[PDB]
Design an enzyme around this catalytic site. Structure first.
Site, short mmCIF file in Angstrom:
data_model
loop_
_atom_site.label_atom_id
_atom_site.label_comp_id
_atom_site.label_asym_id
_atom_site.label_seq_id
_atom_site.Cartn_x
_atom_site.Cartn_y
_atom_site.Cartn_z
N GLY A 99 4.91 6.03 10.19
CA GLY A 99 6.15 5.78 9.46
C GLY A 99 6.78 4.40 9.57
O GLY A 99 7.74 4.08 8.85
N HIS A 135 0.81 -1.20 0.00
CA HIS A 135 0.00 0.00 0.00
C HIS A 135 0.85 1.26 0.00
O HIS A 135 0.33 2.35 0.23
CB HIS A 135 -0.99 0.00 1.17
N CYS A 155 5.71 1.28 8.91
CA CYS A 155 5.34 0.17 8.03
C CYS A 155 6.56 -0.42 7.33
O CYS A 155 7.62 0.21 7.21
CB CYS A 155 4.27 0.61 7.03
C1 LIG Z 1 1.97 2.39 7.45
O1 LIG Z 1 3.14 3.15 7.13
C2 LIG Z 1 1.21 2.92 8.67
C3 LIG Z 1 1.74 2.30 9.97
C4 LIG Z 1 0.75 2.57 11.12
C5 LIG Z 1 0.93 3.99 11.68
C6 LIG Z 1 0.72 3.86 13.18
N1 LIG Z 1 0.52 2.44 13.41
C7 LIG Z 1 0.83 1.70 12.35
O2 LIG Z 1 1.16 0.52 12.38
N2 LIG Z 1 -0.21 2.65 8.54
C8 LIG Z 1 -1.00 3.14 7.59
O3 LIG Z 1 -0.72 4.09 6.87
C9 LIG Z 1 -2.33 2.47 7.42
C10 LIG Z 1 -2.69 2.34 5.93
C11 LIG Z 1 -4.00 1.60 5.61
C12 LIG Z 1 -3.97 0.95 4.24
C13 LIG Z 1 -4.20 0.46 6.58
C14 LIG Z 1 -5.21 2.51 5.66
N3 LIG Z 1 -3.32 3.23 8.15
C15 LIG Z 1 -3.60 3.03 9.42
O4 LIG Z 1 -3.12 2.12 10.05
C16 LIG Z 1 -4.58 4.00 10.06
C17 LIG Z 1 -4.01 4.39 11.41
C18 LIG Z 1 -4.74 5.24 9.17
N4 LIG Z 1 -5.90 3.44 10.28
C19 LIG Z 1 -6.56 2.64 9.42
O5 LIG Z 1 -6.02 1.87 8.64
O6 LIG Z 1 -8.02 2.67 9.44
C20 LIG Z 1 -8.75 1.85 10.35
C21 LIG Z 1 -10.11 2.42 10.63
C22 LIG Z 1 -11.11 1.62 11.18
C23 LIG Z 1 -12.37 2.17 11.43
C24 LIG Z 1 -12.65 3.50 11.14
C25 LIG Z 1 -11.65 4.30 10.60
C26 LIG Z 1 -10.39 3.76 10.35
#
Ligand SMILES: *[C@H](O)[C@H](C[C@@H]1CCNC1=O)NC(=O)[C@H](CC(C)(C)C)NC(=O)C(C)(C)NC(=O)OCc1ccccc1
Length: 303
Positions: free
Chosen positions: A140, A41, A142
């Site tokens: 950051g 992603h 991931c």
């Molecule tokens: C990746 O670089 C990044 C690492 C995370 C940051 C803090 N903790 C981690 O492990 N994560 C992301 O960018 C991640 C991308 C997707 C594809 C999963 C969206 N995003 C998230 O983990 C995030 C914190 C934005 N939340 C999420 O995925 O949405 C879950 C959600 C559930 C219900 C309602 C709204 C959102």
């Protein structure tokens, strides 16, 4: 003497890590021989995306593989489930022995947080009974991976992806399949009601004896049938004859027998602890496996 929440030697892991970017989007990746691996992603910029389509409009120059003062050259690319097997022209010089494993919910791995392609510190974690984990992961981290070491192999067994509204993370195995019912997109996701890893609260207890803490030991024995029936009410996870035999090796060493420690925990779940600490925790820690305690309480090494 003593007992710590240690973690493996993250040494061999640092020499394989590479930064990876594809636009206003940069994460971390893992370099093995001539491949780089990372959560698919990074190609996005998150509601209901479709990487299959997104990736057919991507190239090999769209992936700036970063190796510090070295740029690596995506000569090819593909995709396995939810991981990006970037092929690069050069062979990773610091590559050790390794295996892509998957882990049963309860075991343990250590993690190397990585920023911009750079280790930020190491820690030990465990696969929770909901297929999630509790760690320090920021905006950051991931592409950071989980690993285990049997001497000269590195059992790559997790890759950070996402964080769940309660503060818990969730990633893939190093083959692109999560642990749990999650999708690497931005949709409504409840992690799930989690229980206690009972097979690990009694091995930790044994580690408590090995180091002179006995205020929980007693003379009572007990059966499973009643342990498992008292385990469930305090959310714990019933005990198997399978999980008893492992502890046996540790049961001998301590002159106790596994179901004698069981009823001691039962009297802890019912009474509490009343202002003491077992090994520096006024809690019970379910995050230690029997092979972990054998490892500290004897010291099996790795080189
Ligand atoms: C990746 O670089 C990044 C690492 C995370 C940051 C803090 N903790 C981690 O492990 N994560 C992301 O960018 C991640 C991308 C997707 C594809 C999963 C969206 N995003 C998230 O983990 C995030 C914190 C934005 N939340 C999420 O995925 O949405 C879950 C959600 C559930 C219900 C309602 C709204 C959102």
């Amino acid at each position: 003497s003593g007992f710590r929440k240690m973690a493996f030697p993250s040494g061999k892991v640092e020499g394989c890590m590479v930064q990876v970017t594809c636009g206003t989007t940069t994460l971390n990746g893992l370099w093995l021989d001539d491949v780089v691996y990372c959560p698919r992603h990074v190609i996005c910029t998150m509601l209901n995306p479709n990487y299959e389509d997104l990736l057919i409009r991507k190239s090999n120059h769209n992936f700036l593989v970063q190796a510090g003062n070295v740029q690596l050259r995506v000569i090819g690319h593909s995709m396995q489930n939810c991981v990006l097997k970037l092929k690069v022209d050069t062979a990773n010089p610091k590559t050790p022995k390794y295996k892509f494993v998957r882990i049963q919910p309860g075991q343990t791995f250590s993690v190397l947080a990585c920023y911009n392609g750079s280790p930020s510190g190491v820690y030990q974690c465990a696969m929770r009974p909901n297929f999630t984990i509790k760690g320090s992961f920021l905006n950051g981290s991931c592409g950071s991976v989980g690993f285990n070491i049997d001497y000269d192999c590195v059992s790559f067994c997790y890759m950070h992806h996402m964080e769940l509204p309660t503060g818990v993370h969730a990633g893939t195995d190093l083959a692109g399949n999560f642990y749990g019912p999650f999708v690497d997109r931005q949709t409504a996701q409840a992690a799930g009601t989690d229980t206690t890893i009972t097979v690990n609260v009694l091995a930790w207890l044994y580690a408590a004896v090995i180091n002179g803490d006995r205020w929980f030991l007693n003379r009572f024995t007990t059966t499973l049938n009643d342990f498992n029936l008292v385990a469930m009410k305090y959310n714990y996870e019933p005990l198997t004859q399978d999980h008893v035999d492992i502890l046996g090796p540790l049961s001998a060493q301590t002159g106790i027998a596994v179901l004698d420690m069981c009823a001691s925990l039962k009297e802890l779940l019912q009474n509490g602890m009343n202002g003491r600490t077992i090994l520096g925790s006024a809690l019970l820690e379910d995050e230690f496996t029997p092979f972990d305690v054998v490892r500290q309480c004897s010291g099996v090494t790795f080189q």
